[PDB]
């Protein structure tokens, strides 16, 4: 459950991504909207076409949330508190959608970090994202 080895792996991926995090965040959202159209119903007011500034701005918010999570990895429930309320109580986001976005976030990194996306790093990022998602859906439990 986010062992030292996983933290080391997620911190290494984070480093390589660097300043591209927001752009990759935007890309993952696009990947999700295109691959899983049901998720589009949560963003009725967003324009989801390619190059959309709304998706670019949101990608940055998602990336920023994910970085704040790894930055306080030993206390993600507290750090992700306000976002859990938002996603479960207000937006009523279906738990399955967290899996879909997580899959798209991983796919995006895989497509940008040839060297870093080893089987071990992939397992660590997968567990990192499953933890974030479990925190974001904790308000349903």
């Amino acid at each position: 459950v986010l062992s030292p080895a996983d933290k080391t792996n997620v911190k290494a991926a984070w480093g390589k991504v660097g300043a591209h995090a927001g752009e990759y965040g935007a890309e993952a959202l696009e990947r999700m909207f295109l691959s899983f159209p049901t998720t589009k119903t949560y963003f009725p007011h967003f324009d989801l076409s390619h190059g959309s500034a709304q998706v670019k701005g949101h990608g940055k918010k998602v990336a920023d949330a994910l970085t704040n999570a790894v930055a306080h990895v030993d206390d993600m429930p507290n750090a992700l508190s306000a976002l859990s309320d938002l996603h479960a109580h207000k937006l009523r986001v279906d738990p399955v959608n967290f899996k879909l976005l997580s899959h798209c976030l991983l796919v995006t990194l895989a497509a940008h970090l040839p060297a870093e996306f080893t089987p071990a790093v992939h397992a660590s990022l997968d567990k990192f994202l499953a933890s974030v998602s479990t925190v974001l859906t904790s308000k349903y439990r």
Binding site: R31, L34, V107, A111, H112, P114, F117, P119
Partner: protein
């Protein structure tokens, strides 16, 4: 599964470039490593105690080729995925008793493998087409 002409193009152009001797084993190995409960079904494969052991395991790669062979065959008969995976369905469902959720996990790990290999070339629309394909395949295997 029905893909529009542009989704078939997206899928087919990439597939022809796949190293059929490696990607299959890479997908299976990553599945065993990322979702360790799947290893319960490969007690005979040997050492699966670390990522490297798993990935460099002769049996994992040898078996992955069959898996990739199955997807390829599926790709060719996207209209009759039910007929195509009939026997594989009986095997995984009735004989092995693998929960169908895992067919979806393997399909998605495949998608990650393809993104890793092709990079910028595995665009969002190309991924969207492949998601439709693995869903269809997972569904066909699950019919039993």
């Amino acid at each position: 599964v029905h893909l529009t002409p542009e989704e078939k193009s997206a899928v087919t152009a990439l597939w022809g470039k796949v190293n059929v001797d490696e990607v299959g084993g890479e997908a299976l190995g990553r599945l065993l490593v990322v979702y360790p409960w799947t290893q319960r079904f490969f007690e005979s494969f040997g050492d699966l105690s670390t990522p490297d052991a798993v990935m460099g395991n002769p049996k994992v790669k040898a078996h992955g080729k069959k898996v990739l062979g199955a997807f390829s065959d599926g790709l060719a008969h996207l209209d009759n995925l039910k007929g195509t995976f009939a026997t594989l369905s009986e095997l995984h469902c009735d004989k092995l008793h693998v929960d169908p959720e895992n067919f979806r996990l393997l399909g998605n790990v495949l998608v990650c493998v393809l993104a890793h290999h092709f990079g910028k070339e595995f665009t969002p629309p190309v991924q969207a087409a492949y998601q439709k394909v693995v869903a269809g395949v997972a569904n066909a295997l699950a019919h039993k």
